Amino acid sequence: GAMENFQKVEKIGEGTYGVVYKARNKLTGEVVALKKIRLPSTAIREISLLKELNHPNIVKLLDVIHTENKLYLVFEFLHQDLKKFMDASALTGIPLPLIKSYLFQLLQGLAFCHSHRVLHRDLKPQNLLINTEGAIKLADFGLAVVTLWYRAPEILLGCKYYSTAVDIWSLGCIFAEMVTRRALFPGDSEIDQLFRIFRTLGTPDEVVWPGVTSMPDYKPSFPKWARQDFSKVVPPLDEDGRSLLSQMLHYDPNKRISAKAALAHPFFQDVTKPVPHL
Ligand SMILES: CS(=O)(=O)c1cccc2c(-c3nc(N[C@H]4CCCNC4)ncc3C(F)(F)F)c[nH]c12
């Protein structure tokens, strides 16, 4: 069939959706990442739309193959991801110029996506792919144990209708993690995740987040924790970085900085594109 054209090299992982292989296209010679999804006409169209969402900081969707109760997604292959790179840089830390470069590129990717009203919905270090050229790319565009660490509070509080702000939240959480070498909000249940957020950022109220007390899963019985200083949260990040990060972690989605506006932030005045040691 269609899949005879792909020579499996190795299983590279497995997710909620399905299994990912490193594979070789026998006709093009291309090395690819191949996702097998076990099985809808709406997914076929919504995924096919991702084939046109092409940007240098988005992993390239080469092919959508719907054959025989199975959907295969053929993607560009990259050798490393940010979770593994973070782990390999634990003793030393990712140098700030590279953190900055990565954050900048990811915001370009988001800006592009968000300009087309496409949300990612599920940014996490594992799905941010890096190469030897200094590039970082968004992968695994979510459609609409699964990690909760990068989930925006409006999602946790039961907002049915996400805005692009959910991605900015997630990227802020990733930025802080690259800086501190520890996850910002490592929740192990939805309530633990929400309360970890509250313990750092203050339990939100109508002052800081108009509408919060009407949200579907908002409970008046939530404990009232006070906000901590950001200088406590992400030392030794500089004032530009902390200012940007605070704007990316605003509780209210409508106050949260956009990707486009983040790209103009003074934090990026001295941005460069270093090459990492992989
Ligand atoms: C989170 S999961 O279960 O969905 C999953 C499992 C395994 C690989 C992937 C990838 C992926 N991985 C690579 N490379 C791997 C190489 C090994 C070090 N991590 C990166 N290259 C391209 C992709 C592509 F986005 F195109 F699908 C995306 N999601 C994955």
Is the shortest distance between the CB of 127 and ligand 1 below 6 Å?
Answer: yes
Q: How far is the CA of 60 from the centre of ligand 1 (A)?
A: 12
Rounded CA gap, 79 and 104, in Å?
A: 21
Nearest in space to 149 (alpha carbons), one of 125, 132, 128: 125
* Burial state string for 196-211 with b = 16 or more CB within 10 A and e = fewer than 16: bbbebbbbbeeeebee
86-139-20-142 Cα dihedral, nearest 10 degrees? 120
Segments of the chain assigned E as strands: 6-14, 18-25, 31-38, 61-67, 70-76, 80-81, 128-130, 136-138
List the structure tokens of 233: 């949260």
What are the angstrom distances between the C-alpha of 89 and each of 135, 137, 224, 256?
17, 19, 36, 30
For a mutational test of ligand 1's pocket, the pick from 36, 81, 83, 124, i.e. the residue with the most ligand atoms closer than 8 A to its C-beta, is 81
In angstroms, what is the resolution? 1.7
Rounded CA gap, 31 and 77, in Å?
A: 6
Domains of the chain and any CATH numbers: 6-76 (3.30.200.20), 80-268 (1.10.510.10)
List the structure tokens of 67: 């054959």
Task: Supply φ then ψ for residue 65, to 5 degrees.
Answer: -120, 110
CB 167 within 8 A of CB 120: yes
Burial label for 276, CB within 10 Å (0-12, 13-18, 19+), is buried
Q: How far is the CA of 12 from the centre of ligand 1 (A)?
A: 7
Q: Counting atoms of ligand 1 from 1, which one is nearest the CA of 16? A: 3
CB 135 within 8 A of CB 215: no
Is the shortest distance between the CB of 188 and ligand 1 below 6 Å?
Answer: no
List the structure tokens of 152: 């925006």
Preceding omega of 235 cis (within 30 degrees of 0): no
Q: How far is the CA of 33 from the centre of ligand 1 (A)?
A: 7
